[PDB]
Write a protein that binds this ligand. Structure first.
Ligand code: NA
Length: 711
C-alpha cells in the first residue's frame, strides 16, 4: 500500500470523487482511442472503464498518411468534472488546434454528447461556479464558456471551503473571488486536490520516472494545504494492463480497454473472426519506417519490472513483411519474423540496426520482451522461442530513453507491416503480461566505477532455477581494436555453455586506441574481480570461473590463465603491472580455473613467418604503442608462455590448419610450452581451418572440458 500508486504512464490526471467512487481522466496523446477514464474505490486500485473518443480526426497527421505523424501531440491534458448529475470531460489538441467537450450521465458506459471549437486552450481547467456561470482558466487567463458548450462567449481549479485554490514545483494560488510553494520533492508536480468521504485530503501528482514514463503520485494533505494509510494494492493487472487470449464470448468488447492503437487504426486490416482465438493483423501499405506503420497494437509498460509475451503464426506473411513484438517509442526495439528469419532490431540510433538473426523452420513462433526500470536502469531484453517454455535470448539490450517525441512511456506493441508486398498477415494467439521478471540477463553492467564502454560486461544465467551457477567468461577477437564486441562473443559460445548449466559473462576491454598494454589484461582481471565480489547478487558460484575467447580474446584469456597470482613482472628494462587498479574490488581474487584458447596469438616475436616481428602498422604494434622489433622485451611480457608453471590451470588450445591471420604455429608454440609442465589438456587441430570458419565437435569439447573441471 505504497507510492507510486500507479507505476505506469498515466500523465496529466484530472481526478474527482462522486460518493464512494473516484474517477480520473488522462493523457495518451496520439493513441486511439483517446482520453482514458479510470475508476477507483480506494485511490489505490485503479481500472480503465471508458474512453472519451475513438479517433480524434481524419487528417494525414492523425492517420499516418503521406509520411506524417503527430507523435507527442494529439489529445493533451484533460479536465474532468461532475455537476448536477452530469459528468463533464474536456481536452484540446495541437494536432487540430481545437478544444473538445464531452458529456454523459454514465461515465463508464456513455453515450457522449460532443462539441468542439478553436483555438486549443492550453491546460484549461473549466469550472461550474455557484454564481451560475461556467468559467475557464488556461496558459494564466480567465474567460466564460457558453451554456451548451459549443464555444466561449497545468492549471487545475478547486473551490474548497469557500476559497478558490488553483494548482499549476507545485504552486497554489488562493483567492476569495474568481501564490506560494506547497511541494518541491523530486519534481513530482502537476495535479489537484481530492478528498475522501471521511475527510482526508490528498494531492494527485506525477513524476518523470524515465523510460516507464510519467507515473501517478498521491501525497497526504493537511490544512493552506500542507503536502500510505490506504487499502492494499493489487498491482496493475488487469486494471491498466491485461493479458488477452483473443477469445471472445457473445457480445463482448472486441478489444479490452487496456488496448490502444498507435494513431488511427485501419479497421479493415485487423480481425478476430478470421481465425477464432487469434488476432489477425493484415498489411495494407508498404512502409519505409516502423513509426509510419499502421495497426500497431499497444498496452503500457509497468514498473518496477515487467515482461510481455506473444505466440504468433507466420504462414500468412509475404516477401518483405515484418511482424513481432516491440518496446515502442522513437528509440524502439523490435523482435519478429522477417521474410523466414527470427530477427531483433535496435532503433536507439537514427538508422535501425539488425543485430542477430536466426533462421525459422517452423511457422508457430514465440517472443518475449523484458523491462527493468528498477532504479531507472531502463533496459529491454528480447527473446524468441519455438516452444512453450524454452526461451532463447536474442540480440543486444535496448537502452530505453524517454525522448520527446514520442513524449510517452514505452509501450508493448504487436506489429506486422510490409516493405515490398501487401496482403500478407500474421496471427497472434495471445498477448501475456506479468509484473515478474526472469533476471537471467543483465547487460551493460560496469565492472569498474566508470561509464567507459571498455569496462562493460553482460551476465547470463541458465533459466533452470538453481541457487548458484559456475561461471565462464567470454572475450572477443578484435586484434585488440574493439571495446564493444562482447555481444559477438555471446552469439558464438553463449547458447552452448548455457545449456550445460554455466553462467556466462562476456566482457569488454579497452581498445589499443583507448589505452596500451597492459590495459587489456588489467581489464580482464578487473572483470573477474568484479564477478567474485558481486557473486551472491547474480547467483554466481565462483568456486569455478572458466574463460575463453577467439584470437586476441584467446590471447587475453591465455595470459589470464598463466598469470594467476602474478601482480607484476620485469623482462629486460621493462616492467608491467599485470593486475592493475581498474575497479574498486582489489581485495578479491582475479584467478581463473580453466582456459580454452581459440587460435589466439601468443608470441609476437615470432608472429611473422613463424620467425620475426611485424611492422609498426600490425595490431601488436598498436597494442604496445611502439615498434615491435625494438620492443622485444614488451612482446615477451604480453606472451602467456612467459608465466607457465605446474600450478597454473588446465588449457585447451584450438586452431585451424588454414588460418591466414594467426598461423597454426602460434597455438603449437603455446601447447608445447604448456604440455611440458602438464597444463595442456588437449590440442585440437581442425583440418578445415580458417580464422573462425568453430564447429559442433570443437564447441562440444569446450563444454565437456569446462564441465569436467567444474562438476
Ligand atoms: Na604462472
Amino acid at each position: 500500500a505504497t507510492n507510486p500508486v500507479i507505476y505506469a504512464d498515466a500523465p496529466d490526471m484530472s481526478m474527482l470523487r462522486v460518493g464512494d467512487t473516484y474517477y480520473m481522466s488522462s493523457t495518451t496523446m496520439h493513441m486511439s482511442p483517446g482520453v482514458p477514464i479510470m475508476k477507483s474505490n480506494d485511490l489505490v486500485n485503479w481500472k480503465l472503464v471508458n474512453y472519451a473518443y475513438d479517433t480524434l480526426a481524419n487528417i494525414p497527421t492523425m492517420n499516418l498518411d503521406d509520411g506524417k505523424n503527430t507523435y507527442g501531440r494529439g489529445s493533451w491534458a484533460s479536465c474532468l468534472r461532475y455537476h448536477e448529475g452530469v459528468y463533464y470531460l474536456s481536452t484540446f489538441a495541437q494536432t487540430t488546434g481545437k478544444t473538445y467537450f464531452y458529456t454523459t450521465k454514465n461515465l463508464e458506459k456513455g453515450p457522449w454528447k460532443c462539441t468542439e471549437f478553436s483555438p486549443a486552450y492550453h491546460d484549461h481547467s473549466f469550472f461550474f461556479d455557484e454564481d451560475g456561470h461556467i468559467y475557464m482558466i488556461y496558459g494564466l487567463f480567465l474567460a466564460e464558456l457558453k451554456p451548451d458548450l459549443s464555444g466561449v462567449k497545468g492549471s487545475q481549479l478547486f473551490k474548497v471551503n469557500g476559497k478558490y485554490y488553483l494548482f499549476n514545483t507545485v504552486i497554489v494560488h488562493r483567492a476569495d473571488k474568481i501564490g506560494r510553494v506547497v511541494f518541491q520533492d523530486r519534481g513530482i508536480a502537476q495535479g489537484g486536490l481530492v478528498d475522501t468521504p471521511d475527510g482526508r485530503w490528498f494531492a494527485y501528482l506525477f513524476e518523470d520516472c524515465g523510460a516507464v514514463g510519467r507515473i501517478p503520485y498521491l501525497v497526504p494533505v493537511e490544512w493552506w494545504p500542507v503536502l500510505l494509510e490506504l487499502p492494499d494494492s493489487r498491482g496493475l493487472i488487469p486494471g491498466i494492463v491485461a493479458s488477452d487470449d483473443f477469445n471472445r464470448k457473445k457480445g463482448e468488447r472486441a478489444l479490452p480497454l487496456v488496448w490502444q492503437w498507435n494513431h488511427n487504426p485501419d479497421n479493415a486490416l485487423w480481425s478476430l473472426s478470421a481465425r477464432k482465438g487469434y488476432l489477425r493483423l493484415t498489411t495494407g501499405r508498404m512502409e519505409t519506417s516502423f513509426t509510419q506503420a499502421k495497426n500497431i497494437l499497444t498496452q503500457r509498460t509497468i514498473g518496477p519490472v515487467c515482461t510481455g509475451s506473444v505466440s504468433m503464426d507466420v504462414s500468412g506473411m509475404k516477401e518483405g513483411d515484418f511482424a513481432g513484438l516491440s518496446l515502442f517509442q522513437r528509440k524502439y526495439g523490435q523482435v519478429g519474423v522477417k521474410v523466414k528469419y527470427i530477427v531483433m532490431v535496435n532503433g536507439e540510433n537514427e538508422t535501425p540496426a539488425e543485430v542477430e538473426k536466426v533462421p525459422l523452420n517452423q511457422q508457430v513462433v514465440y517472443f518475449k520482451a523484458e523491462c527493468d526500470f528498477r532504479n531507472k536502469v531502463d533496459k529491454g531484453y528480447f527473446y524468441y522461442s519455438l516452444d512453450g517454455s524454452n526461451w532463447k535470448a536474442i540480440g543486444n539490450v535496448l537502452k530505453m530513453q524517454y525522448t520527446m517525441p514520442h513524449f510517452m512511456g514505452y509501450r508493448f506493441a504487436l506489429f506486422n507491416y510490409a516493405t515490398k508486398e501487401v496482403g500478407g498477415y500474421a496471427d497472434f494467439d495471445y498477448f501475456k503480461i506479468e509484473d515478474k521478471i526472469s533476471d537471467c540477463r543483465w547487460e551493460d553492467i560496469c565492472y569498474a566505477d566508470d561509464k567507459l564502454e571498455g569496462h562493460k560486461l553482460d551476465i547470463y544465467l541458465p533459466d533452470m532455477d538453481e541457487p548458484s551457477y559456475k561461471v565462464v567468461v567470454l572475450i572477443y577477437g578484435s586484434a585488440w581494436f574493439a571495446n564493444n564486441m562482447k555481444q559477438a562473443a555471446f552469439q558464438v559460445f553463449g547458447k552452448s555453455l548455457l545449456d550445460k548449466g554455466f553462467a556466462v559473462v562476456s566482457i569488454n576491454h579497452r581498445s589499443s586506441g583507448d589505452a596500451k598494454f597492459p590495459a587489456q589484461i588489467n581489464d580482464v582481471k578487473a572483470a573477474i574481480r568484479f564477478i567474485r565480489a558481486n557473486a551472491a547478487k547474480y547467483k554466481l558460484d565462483t568456486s569455478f570461473i572458466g574463460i575463453t575467447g577467439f584470437s586476441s580474446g584467446g590471447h587475453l584469456a591465455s595470459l589470464a590463465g598463466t598469470t594467476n597470482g602474478v601482480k607484476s613482472y620485469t623482462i629486460g628494462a621493462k616492467t608491467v603491472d599485470l593486475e592493475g587498479n581498474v575497479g574498486l574490488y582489489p581485495s578479491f581474487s582475479s584467478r581463473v580455473d580453466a582456459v580454452v584458447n581459440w587460435f589466439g596469438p601468443i608470441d609476437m616475436t615470432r608472429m611473422e613467418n613463424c620467425n620475426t616481428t611485424k611492422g609498426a602498422n600490425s595490431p601488436e604494434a598498436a597494442l604496445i604503442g611502439g615498434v615491435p622489433a625494438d620492443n622485444l622485451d614488451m612482446l615477451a611480457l604480453l606472451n602467456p608462455i612467459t608465466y607457465i608453471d605446474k600450478n597454473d590451470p588446465k588449457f585447451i588450445v584450438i586452431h585451424g590448419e588454414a588460418d591466414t591471420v594467426v598461423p597454426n604455429c602460434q597455438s603449437i608454440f603455446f601447447s608445447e610450452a604448456l604440455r611440458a609442465q602438464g597444463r595442456l589438456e588437449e590440442f585440437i587441430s581442425v583440418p578445415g581451418g580458417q580464422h573462425g570458419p568453430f564447429n559442433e565437435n570443437t564447441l562440444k569439447k569446450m563444454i565437456d572440458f569446462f564441465a569436467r573441471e567444474a562438476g
